[PDB]
Amino acid sequence: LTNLVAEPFAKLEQDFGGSIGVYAMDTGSGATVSYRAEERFPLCSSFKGFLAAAVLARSQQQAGLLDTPIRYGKNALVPWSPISEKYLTTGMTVAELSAAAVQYSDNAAANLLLKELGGPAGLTAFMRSIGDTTFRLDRWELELNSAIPGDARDTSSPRAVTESLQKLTLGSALAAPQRQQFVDWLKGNTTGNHRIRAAVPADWAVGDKTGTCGVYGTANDYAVVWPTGRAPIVLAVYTRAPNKDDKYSEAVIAAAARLALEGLGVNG
Ligand SMILES: *C(=O)N1C[C@H](NOS(=O)(=O)O)CC[C@H]1C(=O)NC1CCNCC1
């Protein structure tokens, strides 16, 4: 049921000047669209969705976790911390940092939450615990964005991203209340309007998390999509390119998402 219908991903990536990796699953039939799906691509900010899921998993054992207020210093505010910079003088709760990391891609929030989990290895351990043997987080913000060609640090594959996203949003990897909180955070993302969402009809529900490393044409998005009248679709679209100053493209991500939906025979 993989690639029943071929789609022109090769032409798309050639025009982009790099590589595009796609994995999309129709959770009803199990049909898939797969292109470069087992290659590694940098996560960039996209690790923050999984980070929030890991915090939610912890919260199942620690009922006071999400309400815990976290104070932080000005030194915590690395570049691109749009929410946490507004609460420097007050603090934010763990839940609020999680929402900020997911919905505004807040970097300070992400580092504070990584500390809660025991760092990159702690997040990696959570991903192993759900059966993902591909994901690896190695570094913190901002160093994890280097996106060096051939470097496996801070990467996953489109396939493993999709598989893990399915387990966490639709499967049993989180308890039901936490699963719905994760979904709600993804649905409230503000940074993805020009990526997978641009390929998804306005009357379908969707949650996503983006990433943009800033170098090597490297950017991404993953999403759960609920078309009306049929089972949800999970998909991941990752890009990279050979040269350090190659620019990412949101349009290319949207276009790859459209091809994926077409390949699944989802009328959109
Ligand atoms: C994540 O990849 N980020 C965080 C933020 N927006 O995330 S995104 O998924 O919407 O793109 C800005 C881009 C990126 C990031 O951390 N970039 C570094 C900090 C800002 N200067 C460039 C490198």
Residue numbers in the entry: 25 to 57, 59 to 252, 254 to 294
How does the study describe this entry?
Of particular clinical importance is the widely disseminated class A SBLs, including the mobile, plasmid-encoded extended-spectrum CTX-M and carbapenem-hydrolyzing KPC families (both produced in opportunistic Gram-negative bacteria, such as Klebsiella pneumoniae, Pseudomonas aeruginosa, and Escherichia coli), as well as chromosomally encoded L2 from Stenotrophomonas maltophilia (a lung colonist of cystic fibrosis patients). SBLs hydrolyze antibiotics via formation of a hydrolytically labile acyl enzyme intermediate, while MBL catalysis proceeds without a covalent intermediate. The diazabicyclooctanes (DBOs), including avibactam, relebactam, and others, are a new BLI class with improved activity against a wider range of SBL targets than classic BLI scaffolds. DBOs inhibit SBLs through covalent formation of a carbamyl ester to the active-site serine concomitant with DBO ring opening.
Relebactam cocomplex structures were obtained after 16-h soaks for CTX-M-15 (1.12 Å, P212121), L2 (1.78 Å, P212121), KPC-2 (1.04 Å, P21212), KPC-3 (1.06 Å, P21212), and KPC-4 (1.04 Å, P21212). In the KPC variants, structures obtained from diffraction data sets collected after exposing crystals to relebactam for 16 hours were observed to contain both intact and desulfated (i.e., in the imine form) relebactam in the active site, at variable occupancies. Consistent with this possibility, in the KPC-2, KPC-3, and KPC-4 structures, inspection of electron density maps indicated the presence of desulfated relebactam, which could be modelled as the imine form of the inhibitor, with occupancies of 0.35, 0.33, and 0.65 for KPC-2, -3, and -4, respectively. The imine group points toward the flexible Trp105, but otherwise, the DBO core closely resembles intact relebactam. In KPC-3 and -4 relebactam complexes, Trp105 is modelled in one conformation, similar to one of the two conformations observed in KPC-2, albeit with high B-factors (30.95 and 33.19 compared with average protein B-factors of 13.61 and 13.24, respectively), suggesting there is still flexibility and movement of this residue. In this conformation, Trp105 faces the DBO core, with the nitrogen of the pyrrole ring ∼3.0 Å from the relebactam imine N6. This is concomitant with well-defined electron density for the relebactam piperidine ring. However, in each of the three KPC complexes, in all of which relebactam was a modelled as a mixture of intact and desulfated forms, Lys73 is at least 0.4 Å more distant from Ser130 than is the case for either the CTX-M-15 (either conformation) or L2 structures.
